[PDB]
Structures are given as structure tokens and as C-alpha cells.
Paper text:
Transthyretin (TTR) is a homotetrameric protein produced mainly in the liver and in the brain's choroid plexus, and circulates in plasma and cerebrospinal fluid. TTR is composed of four identical 127 amino-acid residue β-sheet-rich subunits, termed A, B, C and D11. The TTR tetramer is formed by association of the AB and CD dimers. The weaker dimer–dimer interface defines two, largely unoccupied (<1% T4 bound), funnel-shaped T4-binding sites.
We obtained a co-crystal structure of tolcapone and WT-TTR at 1.15 Å. This high-resolution crystal allows the unambiguous placement of tolcapone in the butterfly-shaped electron density map of the TTR dimer–dimer interface. The twofold symmetry axis along the hormone-binding pocket creates two binding modes of tolcapone related by a 180° rotation. The 4-methylphenyl ring of tolcapone sits deep within the inner cavity of the T4-binding site, establishing hydrophobic interactions with residues composing the two symmetrical T4-Halogen-Binding Pockets HBP2–2′ and HBP3–3′ (Ala108, Leu110, Ser117 and Thr119). In addition, a specific hydrogen bond interaction is formed between the central carbonyl group of tolcapone and the hydroxyl side chain of Thr119 (at 2.55 Å). The side-chains of Thr119 and Ser117 display two or three different conformations, respectively, probably caused by the interaction with the two symmetrical binding modes of tolcapone. On the outer binding region, the 3,4-dihydroxy-5-nitrophenyl ring of tolcapone is placed in the hydrophobic environment created by residues from the HBP2 and -2′ and HBP1 and -1′ pockets (Lys15, Leu17, Thr106 and Ala108). Remarkably, in this outer binding pocket the ɛ-amino group of Lys15 is sandwiched between the two hydroxyl groups of the phenyl ring of tolcapone (at 2.97 and 3.22 Å, respectively) and the carboxylate group of Glu54 (2.87 Å). These electrostatic interactions by Lys15 close the cavity around tolcapone, restricting the entrance of solvent into the HBP pockets in such a way that the tolcapone salt bridge with Lys15 and the polar interactions with Thr119 are both partially shielded. The higher solvation interface between dimers in the TTR/tolcapone crystal structure with respect to the TTR/tafamidis structure suggests a lower water rearrangement, contributing thus to tolcapone's lower desolvation entropy for binding.
Residue numbers in the entry:
A (entry chain B), B (entry chain A), C (entry chain B), D (entry chain A): 10 to 125
The structure:
Amino acid sequence: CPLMVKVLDAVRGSPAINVAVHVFRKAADDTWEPFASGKTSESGELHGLTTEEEFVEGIYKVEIDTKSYWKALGISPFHEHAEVVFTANDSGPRRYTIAALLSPYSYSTTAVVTNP
Amino acid sequence: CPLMVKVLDAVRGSPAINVAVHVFRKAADDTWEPFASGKTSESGELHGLTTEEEFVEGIYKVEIDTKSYWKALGISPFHEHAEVVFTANDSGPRRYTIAALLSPYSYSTTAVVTNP
Amino acid sequence: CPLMVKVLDAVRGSPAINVAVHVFRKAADDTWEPFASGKTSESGELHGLTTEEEFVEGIYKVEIDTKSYWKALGISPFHEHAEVVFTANDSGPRRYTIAALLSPYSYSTTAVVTNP
Amino acid sequence: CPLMVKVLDAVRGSPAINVAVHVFRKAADDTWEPFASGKTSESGELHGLTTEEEFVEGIYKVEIDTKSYWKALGISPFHEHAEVVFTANDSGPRRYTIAALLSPYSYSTTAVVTNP
Ligand SMILES: Cc1ccc(C(=O)c2cc(O)c(O)c([N+](=O)[O-])c2)cc1
Ligand SMILES: Cc1ccc(C(=O)c2cc(O)c(O)c([N+](=O)[O-])c2)cc1
């Protein structure tokens, strides 16, 4: 439950379905190690990336392949991707929802962080 | 130049040009009194709505005709308009820029408030 | 299920809890008739406002009392409220989520509209 | 003036002043090559990063040091930075304005791309 990614389309007012998402964690030697990946479901959500026990303190990067999503709709968007980089679990375990709202020339992202 | 409105298009990545904007001030009977109006320029900006002397404290409404903008582009919009309601000049005269970033099914608005 | 309102706080990265929401529908004589109201729960969501059968075609207004939310946190925000006005069910019944992401001097809103 | 970056603060309702911004171009080996850098002015804008001749087609990254900005304000931020990655000049030279609207737990970015 501790990391969920949600992607919405601001053109159609819909979930953004089948969007690829890759998560990385920064290693002690400062490289980015692959951590998890998946694609958004029919609801625009990607669940099941990690576990409380695996999701230790660290700096995480979430890269959302927004360009492929728009190109499959015939659009050449501005951004190559949307990346979110954040320190997690620095004050103890938390649940993180990373949400992204997509348009061809803009995106917004927010974090909802809760303490279970 | 105490009040400026700027409108941007997140689909095209451009200013939102020729968008109609109406400004109201709340009357004592809580109805909306017409104040100023205009259309955005080629830069997406609308200047010259009021003066220092006329822009006194009060609650103001800015209505942006987003639906007409998207219809003119042949794109289906969700909202009937975008309205921004705010109390002006609470703590001395300010310069206000009201910016709106438009997508068909979402919009954002921010205020940039600087002290002359 | 057909109308849900969700409110998030972009300062704390959290649901916006206990936010008052009033919904209105435009009558045939062009006045706004109260339709439903409620406040957001612990998850930032407000469920149970209406039913498929009551939620007929029409122009609806959702007014979110963002100013009281910020004032209870000690903040004097820019906006008096966040209002969302939209035509619903014009092409047949749909489910609508109206989401608002709040900051003291900005807000975003999106609609997620699905066909059940 | 082909590239300008503008940063705004959604908490204060102001330009985000003195924000560090670094621009990179993707090298043939897929590493990021340093390109230009600066800090936002009192208007929240950063001008003068490049020239027409130097800003050739390529994939560019703009990294905005949002975490340092919020720490300087004494406000806890979520993100380590905000990055914008885009392919420039695909269809002839453009003027790009990259705007970012910052909150502690959310940010938005849009591109305003106009043709000289
Ligand atoms: C909510 C929101 C988000 C992004 C923009 C936005 O992209 C923008 C672009 C500009 O060139 C500009 O000059 C301003 N402004 O000063 O307010 C805003 C405008 C509104
Ligand atoms: C304008 C805007 C941008 C981002 C969010 C947003 O972060 C968000 C988060 C959720 O968990 C969620 O379920 C939804 N939703 O379905 O609408 C939106 C909400 C509003």
C-alpha cells in the first residue's frame, strides 16, 4: 500500500490509462537503481509497486511516460516525461499517492502523504 | 495597472487569445455589479481594466469565458466558465495579476500580488 | 454514485478535511436552486450528494468553501471560494468526480467523467 | 531570447525570487551536459540563458531548485527539485517560456511556445 501513482487526462476528463511508470531509488553511491515499474489501470491508478518493508527511507524518482501516452492519441506533446523526485519515509513510514494531471503542453503533480 | 488578467492554453502551449473577461464588484445587496471587461490580447493578457482610484477595497469577481474559447477551437469543454472571486486591497492597494491556465476539463488559477 | 467532490491541500500534501461544499442546479427561470450540500471527510472526499435518478440533465454549480478551510489554519487566502459550473448528463448519465487542489493563492480543478 | 523561465509561488501569491535554475542538453551518450544557469529575478523570470544560434534542436532539461526555495522560506517541501524535459525546435526555431507554479507538496509546469 505505501506507493500509488495516479494519472489523469485534463483534455478528456478521464483517467490516463496504460501509462508506463518507472520508479528508481538512489543508491549509496548516488546512482539510480531500478526499484519498480508498471502501467496505469482503467482507473488511471498503479497499485502494488512495493511493500512497507521494501520501501525504506530513501530518495525515490517516479518517471511517468507521458510522451507515449500523447503520441498514441496522435499528439506531439511538449514534455518528454513527467518526473517526480522526493525523499520518502524520512520521519517514519508513510503512504504516498503521487498524482499527475496531464495536458499536451502542461502537467501538474501533487503528493498526498498519509500516516496509516 | 492595478488589475491584469492573463490566460494561457495548456493544449496548444500558447497564450489564450481573444478570451472574453468580465469583472464585477459585489453590491451591498450581494448582487454582482458590472465593473470592467475586455478580451485577452495576442500575449494572453488583458490590461487597462481599472485605475488605482477606482479599484477600492471590495470583493471582486473575474469571469473568464472559457467555453466560448474552446468552442471556437472545435474542442469539447467541461466548464461553463471560469470564475475567480477575491477580496481586493485588504491591507493597502496591491497590483494583482490573475492568471488562468486552461485545459478542456481542468483549469488553474493563481494570483500574483505585488506591492507598488 | 454520480457526483463526488474531492479536495486536496497542496501545502501539506493531504486531504482537505471538513471543507463545506454546496451544489446548486440552474432552474428553468435561470435561478440557482439548492441541490445538495455536505463536507469533505477524512479522505478529502464527499460522497452521497445525489442519486442517478435525481441527477438529471442540467447546469450544476459546485461551490467549495476554501476560504474557511484556510482561515481555520490561520491563513487569509486569496480566493473567497472555488466554484465549478458545468453542464451534466447532456449526452446520457455519467459519473462525475470534481477535484480541487488548494493553495492559499491558487487552486486547480479537474473533472473526471466516466460512463458506468 | 529563445528560452525564458518563470517561477511563481502559490503560497505567497508572488513571484518566486532567487530560485536557482540549471539548463542541460542531452549529450550523444545520453548524459546531461550543462548549458546555462541563473537565478530568477524579482519578477520571477530568468532571461538571457541562451541565443538563437546556440539553441539548436535537441532535448533540453530545466532543473528548478524548489527545495532550496522552500527551505529558505522555512516551509517543509516534498520534492527534491522540479525538472522539465522537452525537445526543442522540432518544427523551426521557437520562443519558449517555461513557467512553474510552486506549492510545497505540488507543482505545475506549462510551456508557452510562440513563433518569432
Ligand atoms: C495557474 C497558472 C499556471 C501557470 C501559468 C503560466 O504559465 C504563466 C505564464 C506566463 O508567461 C505568465 O506571465 C504568468 N503570470 O505572470 O501569471 C503565468 C498561469 C497560471
Ligand atoms: C486539479 C487536481 C490535480 C490533482 C489532484 C490529485 O492529486 C488527485 C489525487 C487523487 O488521489 C485522486 O483520486 C484524484 N481524482 O480522482 O481526481 C486527484 C486533484 C486535482
